[PDB]
Each structure stands twice: as C-alpha cells, then as structure tokens.
Short mmCIF file of N, CA and C in Angstrom, two decimals:
data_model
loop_
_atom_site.label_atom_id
_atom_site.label_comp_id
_atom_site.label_asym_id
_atom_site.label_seq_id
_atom_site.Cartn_x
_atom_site.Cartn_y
_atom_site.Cartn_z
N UNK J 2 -5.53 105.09 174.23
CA UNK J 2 -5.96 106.48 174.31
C UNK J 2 -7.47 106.57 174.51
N UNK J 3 -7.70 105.91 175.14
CA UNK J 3 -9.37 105.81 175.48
C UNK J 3 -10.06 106.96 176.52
N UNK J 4 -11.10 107.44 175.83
CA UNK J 4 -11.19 108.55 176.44
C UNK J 4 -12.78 108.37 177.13
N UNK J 5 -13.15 108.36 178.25
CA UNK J 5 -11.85 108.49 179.99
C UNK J 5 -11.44 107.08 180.44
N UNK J 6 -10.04 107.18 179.88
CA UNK J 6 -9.53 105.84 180.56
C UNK J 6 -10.01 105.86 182.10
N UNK J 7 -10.54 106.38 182.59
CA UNK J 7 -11.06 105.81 183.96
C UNK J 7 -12.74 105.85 184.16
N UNK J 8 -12.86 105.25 184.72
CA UNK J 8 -14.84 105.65 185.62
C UNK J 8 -15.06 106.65 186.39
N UNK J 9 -13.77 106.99 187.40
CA UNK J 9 -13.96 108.34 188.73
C UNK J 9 -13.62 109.39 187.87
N UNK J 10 -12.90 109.65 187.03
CA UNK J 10 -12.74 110.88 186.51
C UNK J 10 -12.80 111.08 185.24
N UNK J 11 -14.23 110.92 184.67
CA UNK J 11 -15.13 111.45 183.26
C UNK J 11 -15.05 113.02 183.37
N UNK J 12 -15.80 113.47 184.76
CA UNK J 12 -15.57 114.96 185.11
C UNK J 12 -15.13 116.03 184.43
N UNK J 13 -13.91 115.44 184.36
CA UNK J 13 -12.80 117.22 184.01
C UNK J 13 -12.62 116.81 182.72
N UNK J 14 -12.38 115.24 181.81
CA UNK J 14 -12.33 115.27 180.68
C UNK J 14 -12.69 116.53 179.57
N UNK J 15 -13.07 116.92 179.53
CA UNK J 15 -13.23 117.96 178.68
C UNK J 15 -14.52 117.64 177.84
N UNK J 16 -15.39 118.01 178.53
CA UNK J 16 -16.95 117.69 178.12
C UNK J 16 -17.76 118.57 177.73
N UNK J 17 -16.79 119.12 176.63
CA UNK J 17 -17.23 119.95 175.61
C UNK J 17 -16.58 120.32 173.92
N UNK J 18 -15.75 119.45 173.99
CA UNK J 18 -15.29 119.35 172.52
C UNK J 18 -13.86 117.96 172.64
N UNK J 19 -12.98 118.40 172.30
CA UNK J 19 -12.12 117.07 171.66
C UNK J 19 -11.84 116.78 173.05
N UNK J 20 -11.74 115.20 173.04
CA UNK J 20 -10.87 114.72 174.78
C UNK J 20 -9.36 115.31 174.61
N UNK J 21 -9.79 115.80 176.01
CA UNK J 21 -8.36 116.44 176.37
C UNK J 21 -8.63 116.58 178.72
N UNK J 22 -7.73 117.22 179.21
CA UNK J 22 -7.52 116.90 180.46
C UNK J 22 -7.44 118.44 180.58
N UNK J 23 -8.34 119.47 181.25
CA UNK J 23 -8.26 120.95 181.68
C UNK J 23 -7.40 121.46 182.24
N UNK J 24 -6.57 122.33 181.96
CA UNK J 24 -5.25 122.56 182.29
C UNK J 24 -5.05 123.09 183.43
N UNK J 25 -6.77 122.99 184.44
CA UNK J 25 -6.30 123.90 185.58
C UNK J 25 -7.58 123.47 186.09
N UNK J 26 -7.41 123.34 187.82
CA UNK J 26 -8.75 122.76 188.46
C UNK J 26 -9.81 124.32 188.63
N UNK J 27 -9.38 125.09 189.03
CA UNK J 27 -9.56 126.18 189.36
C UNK J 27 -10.02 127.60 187.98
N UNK J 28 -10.76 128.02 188.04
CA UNK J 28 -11.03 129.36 186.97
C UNK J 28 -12.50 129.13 186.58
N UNK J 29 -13.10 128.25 186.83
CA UNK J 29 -14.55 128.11 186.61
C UNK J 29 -15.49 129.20 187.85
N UNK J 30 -16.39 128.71 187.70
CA UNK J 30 -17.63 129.25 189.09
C UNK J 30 -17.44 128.50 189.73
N UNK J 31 -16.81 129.38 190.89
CA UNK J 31 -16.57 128.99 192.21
C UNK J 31 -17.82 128.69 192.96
N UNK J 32 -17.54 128.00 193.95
CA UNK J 32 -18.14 127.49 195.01
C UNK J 32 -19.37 128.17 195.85
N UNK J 33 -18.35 129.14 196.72
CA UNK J 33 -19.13 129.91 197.26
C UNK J 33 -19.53 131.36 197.59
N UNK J 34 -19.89 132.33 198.02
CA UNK J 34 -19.88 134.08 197.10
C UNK J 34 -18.99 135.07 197.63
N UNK J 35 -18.43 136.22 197.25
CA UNK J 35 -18.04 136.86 197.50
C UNK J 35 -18.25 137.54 198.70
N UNK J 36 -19.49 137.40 199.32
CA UNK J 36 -20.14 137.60 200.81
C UNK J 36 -19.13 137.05 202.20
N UNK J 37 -19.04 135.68 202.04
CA UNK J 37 -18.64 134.89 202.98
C UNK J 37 -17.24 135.15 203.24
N UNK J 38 -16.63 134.82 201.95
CA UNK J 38 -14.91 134.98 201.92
C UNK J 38 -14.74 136.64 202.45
N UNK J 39 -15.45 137.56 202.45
CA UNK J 39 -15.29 139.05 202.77
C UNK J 39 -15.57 139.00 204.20
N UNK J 40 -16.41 138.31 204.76
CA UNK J 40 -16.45 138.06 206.20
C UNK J 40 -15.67 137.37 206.55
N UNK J 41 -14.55 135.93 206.06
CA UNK J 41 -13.88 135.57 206.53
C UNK J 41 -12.45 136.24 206.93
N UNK J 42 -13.07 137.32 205.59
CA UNK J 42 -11.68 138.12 205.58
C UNK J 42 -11.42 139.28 206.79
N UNK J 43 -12.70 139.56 207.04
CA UNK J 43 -12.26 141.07 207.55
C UNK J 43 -13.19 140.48 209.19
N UNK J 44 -14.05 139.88 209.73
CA UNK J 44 -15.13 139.60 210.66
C UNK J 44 -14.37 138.51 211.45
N UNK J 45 -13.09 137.66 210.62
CA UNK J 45 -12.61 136.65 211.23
C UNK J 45 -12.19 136.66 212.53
N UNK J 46 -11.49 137.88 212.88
CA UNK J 46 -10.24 138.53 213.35
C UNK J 46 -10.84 139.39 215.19
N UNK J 47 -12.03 139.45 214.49
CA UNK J 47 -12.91 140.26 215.78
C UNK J 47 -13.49 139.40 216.27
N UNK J 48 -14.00 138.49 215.87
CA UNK J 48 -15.32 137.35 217.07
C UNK J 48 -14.30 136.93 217.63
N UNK J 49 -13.91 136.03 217.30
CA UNK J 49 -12.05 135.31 217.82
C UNK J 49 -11.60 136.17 219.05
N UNK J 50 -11.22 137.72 219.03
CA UNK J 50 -10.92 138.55 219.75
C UNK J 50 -11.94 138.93 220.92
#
C-alpha cells in the first residue's frame, strides 16, 4: 500500500490529506476560459462557412 506506488503518477494522489486516488479527473480549474469555448461554440460555424 505504498503511497504512490508509482513515479508518473504522484499527481492526482491526493496531495492534500490522507493517500487516496481523486474520484474524478475533471471538476478542478480548467484549462482554458470561458472566452474561447464561447467562440468555439457559436464563431465555429461561420468562418468554416
């Protein structure tokens, strides 16, 4: 039970209280802003066109 049985993935261990493995990759601060993804969303559709 060695905690992080590995070297590549210390990461997600839970590096902030008891070892444990985060039950989800996703729900933190994202990447990149609400700006871009709104242009991908709606601006995609017209240059393309």
């Amino acid at each position: 039970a060695t905690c992080p049985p590995f070297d590549f993935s210390t990461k997600y261990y839970d590096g902030d209280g008891g070892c444990q493995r985060q039950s989800s990759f996703f729900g933190g601060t994202t990447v990149l802003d609400q700006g871009v993804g709104y242009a991908v969303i709606l601006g995609f559709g017209a240059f393309f066109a």
